[model samples]
Target chain A: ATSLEKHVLLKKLRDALESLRGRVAGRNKDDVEEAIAMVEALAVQLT
Target chain B: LEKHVLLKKLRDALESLRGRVAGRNKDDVEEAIAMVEALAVQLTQREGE
Candidate 1:
């Protein structure tokens, strides 16, 4: 299983990320990558 | 193989999460955890055992 799906705590982490998707997804690659990285970091915090 | 099914959960949970944050899906906020979990699982599944 991948890190995103297997972890039971994923939902909370995802909600946090999901809330900010609009700000992240509609950006350029650099922006998106940075945003994704930020989300990933936030996700780590959740874990 | 069934990642698509899993994806739906991911998207739904993400949308749910988004809704929650945006002050939309107050009731479905409980789904926040699943979205993160789904993404984690998908990443692992994609790597293949």
Candidate 2:
């Protein structure tokens, strides 16, 4: 149970979420990373 | 209002909501808003391209 990083995992999920950001079903890898970054920042704050 | 614009606004609200809410929902909101901002940027850039 020590392996889980909820914040990190929460941040990582942004990658999957960002996929829906672009044109209908369009991929946004760059933005995916970008969102991941923002989520990472938030994770830090909450942790 | 366009979806992207609304998303941008929602993103702001979600960010600020962190100031108000706590517990699991707070974390959920953070995840939601981060994606909202990204979607807003994507929509903004799509229009630009």
- Report interface Cα RMSD per prediction: 9.7, 11.3
Model 1 chain B weakest 10-residue run by lDDT: B20-29
What's the C-alpha lDDT at position A26 in model 2? 28
Candidate number achieving the greatest TM-score relative to the actual structure: 2
Residue-level lDDT of model 2, residues A1-47, one tens digit each, is 12254444554445544443442222333443454466555545446
Interface RMSD of 1: 9.7
lDDT of 2 by residue, B1-49 (tens): 2644434444655566546545554565567766555544544664436
Q: TM-scores of the models, in the given order? A: 0.25, 0.40
Q: Please count the clashing residue pairs in each candidate, in the order shown.
A: 24, 0
DockQ, model 1, C-alpha based: 0.14
Which candidate achieves the best DockQ against the true structure? 1
DockQ of each: 0.14, 0.04
The fraction of reference A/B contacts recovered in model 2 reads 0.00
* Consecutive 10-residue window with the lowest summed lDDT within model 2 chain B: B1-10
lDDT of 1 by residue, A1-47 (tens): 44544454554544554444444323222432343454455556547
